[PDB]
């Protein structure tokens, strides 16, 4: 039978799909390690590998980006998990290795990719502690061209007032995205800063796993795709939105968890974002 992981149901994305809307039409760009696009529960429609040493896409040897995948779009069907936005449209933009690291150059690579081939929504399930002016300018790009951009907001924890957030979650164009578990409460490597933006489940999320199976991982790199999916659900019953609108609807109807520093504007809620 199929499962649906507690941070699916913890964003309230059940209720849109009772509405009717699963993503359906929406392009996600699923900026990461590849999408196993054999996996039974995952519908990859396209893609392109920007890491020299692995051509193909299609394939993932990390599992990193296989697992977000499943976050944002597990199939609804008999088996498996399921995702935020199970009818998106999930484009698998390999700009990491196997061994889940890339470089800048890649990076913007994909998301140059992401804009030309014209993706509603980029997940970027990464980061670092310092960007570079490249990738500033084509996620401004990204951004100003009319893309939702969800970046993880690290996993550095707390270090006493200071930011920890990494690029390019730090930017102000994308979202920045922190953890918290099944109880709300911030996972103690969640990165904090004053451009932290939102949280949402980032302990022990179950998701798909390349070879077709399944397994729990934790991150901000988990919590992301929650938002990215998110994003997807919103367009899907607001084609006409904006970037910057479902930006702004993500972040006002979250929920109130505690400090801003730690927490951002708290939970998101997609139910109360889509009305």
């Not at 920007?50 to 599992?63: A, H, I, L, R, W």
């Not at 998110?230 to 109130?256: C, F, G, M």
């Amino acid at each position: 039978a199929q499962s649906v992981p507690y941070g699916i149901s913890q964003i309230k994305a059940p209720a849109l799909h009772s509405q009717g809307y699963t993503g359906s039409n929406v392009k996600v760009a699923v900026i990461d390690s590849g999408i196993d696009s054999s996996h039974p529960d995952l519908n990859v429609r396209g893609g392109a590998s920007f890491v020299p040493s692995e051509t193909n896409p299609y394939q993932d040897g990390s599992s990193h980006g296989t697992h977000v995948a499943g976050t944002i779009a597990a199939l609804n069907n008999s088996i498996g998990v399921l995702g935020v936005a199970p009818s998106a449209s999930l484009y698998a933009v390999k700009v990491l290795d196997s061994t889940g690291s890339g470089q800048y150059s890649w990076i913007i690579n994909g998301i140059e990719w992401a804009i030309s081939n014209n993706m509603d929504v980029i997940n970027m399930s990464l980061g670092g502690p310092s960007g570079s002016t490249a990738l500033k300018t084509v996620v401004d790009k990204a951004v100003s061209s009319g893309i939702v951009v969800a970046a993880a907001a690290g996993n550095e924890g707390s270090s006493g007032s200071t930011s920890t957030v990494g690029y390019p979650a730090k930017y102000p164009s994308t979202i920045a995205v922190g953890a918290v578990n099944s109880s709300n409460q911030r996972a103690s490597f969640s990165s904090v800063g004053s451009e932290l933006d939102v949280m949402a489940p980032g302990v022990s999320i179950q998701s798909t796993l390349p070879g077709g199976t399944y397994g729990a991982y934790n991150g901000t790199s988990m919590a992301t795709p929650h938002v990215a999916g998110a994003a997807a659900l919103i367009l899907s019953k607001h084609p006409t939105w904006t970037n910057a609108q479902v930006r702004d609807r993500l972040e006002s109807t979250a929920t109130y968890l505690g400090n801003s520093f730690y927490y951002g504007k708290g939970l998101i809620n997609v139910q109360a974002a889509a009305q």
